[PDB]
Amino acid sequence: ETEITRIEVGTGAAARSIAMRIFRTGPALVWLGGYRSDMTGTKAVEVERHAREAGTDCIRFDYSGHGASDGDYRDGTISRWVEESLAVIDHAATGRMILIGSSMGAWVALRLAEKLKGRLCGLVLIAPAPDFTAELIEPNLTEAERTSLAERGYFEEPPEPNVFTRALIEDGRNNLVMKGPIETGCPVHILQGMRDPDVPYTHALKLMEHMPADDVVMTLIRDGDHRLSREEDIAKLKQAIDAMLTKA
Template sequence: MQLPCETPFQIELAQHEVLRGYLHDTGSGPIGVFLPGFASDMQGSKSQLLAQHAQRLGRSWLRFDYRGIGRSDGDFAGLSISRYLEDVEAILALVAPRPLVLVGSSMGGWVATLAAQRYPQRIRALLLIAPAYNFIQDYFAALPTEEQKDWQETGLRHWQLGPYGPRFPLAFGAVEDAAAYDLLRHPPRLAIPTLILHGSADDAVPLQRSFTFADLASSPSLAIRVLPGIDHRLQGAERQLLQGVDEVWLAVAAAAAL
């Protein structure tokens, strides 16, 4: 659903695949960008809530679908961290040279952190929602040996989100690709305001994963806010989510004023 004041955009990438999204641009200042999680798109509740909040406060905001999801072209089975980073790089080029505030949810938090390492001059702050660092490797490692072997030999596995959720095809290349982006083995240096929101009742990404990351990362401005009783979807914590966005946004504004 397109919100008032949003303008649709599209970017043609490799193999003539088109990346699509919506942009509300006030013409100056930073642009907020939401990076959804695994198998999520820009029509999700967090995505729309953040876009609406930005419009109310007169902030520029962008939301989009990765290739293979939602309105964008591409095959979901070809998902990889490398491909998601290519999509984010296309977004950076679209709005260059404006600074960005990235809000990444779950897998989007992993991608956002990597993008901040690559583009420290463009990305000025991070809000990470239960960032799912290394979850692809963890998923593979937790499979029985026979299932690991089958995925490697056939090159494809159907990944189910929960016992009653939809099933998504995923190529084994995603596992091989993810190894290059292990932020727990090769922790990043983040010199920008970074806030992690993580629910204490998250059964998809353990809360301890965020604390492990924070212990390893070199980041003088990183904080973790635990949301008591909140699960991975962040339902019931909408107010805390918007407060978090406001905090990192104001931190960017304060740094620009120095």
């Protein structure tokens, strides 16, 4: 329903076209997706759908190497994808916004939250995966996996296998957000499933511990997995966005 518009991010051989779907109603919502997802995913589609009911705009886009944007995802880094998110926000966000980040998008959202001090009114983090290169991937590397990162510059995770590049892991240490106290200046809501097989729910708890006292809430779902895309999971996401909208 919402048509794709595009901006060029980066210069020279790093220049790449970023696809965006900017919805305008008749406090925008901004979506930041996962590591190898795209803006047509279930949760992303439901966020713009929430914007249609709350009478607000919605900003969705695809990272480079994702969805309808240029490039190979194996050439991407957190810095590159943060850059694209900033560029899309500067181009589309005409005012206040609520950042909604899922997994790697939550890591991107937290980096954007620091540079945002439009203005941030709320944070909704879905199965948040901040610092996952240093917190989750690095401590669980087999000696055969790091040998691949040394001789090949990447490693493969077991129908197409996820490839984590050496550059992604190295750039991740320059984008760590759990370096200390995390002041977002806005209410925060975390959605997390206890049966998450990719981001252990304690990782979300560790992230929440790094946030100060003021308005951080977590909805912990006992039977939820990493995607959290069931109808009941989406219902709680919509309620978390509704809470952000009522306190803004």
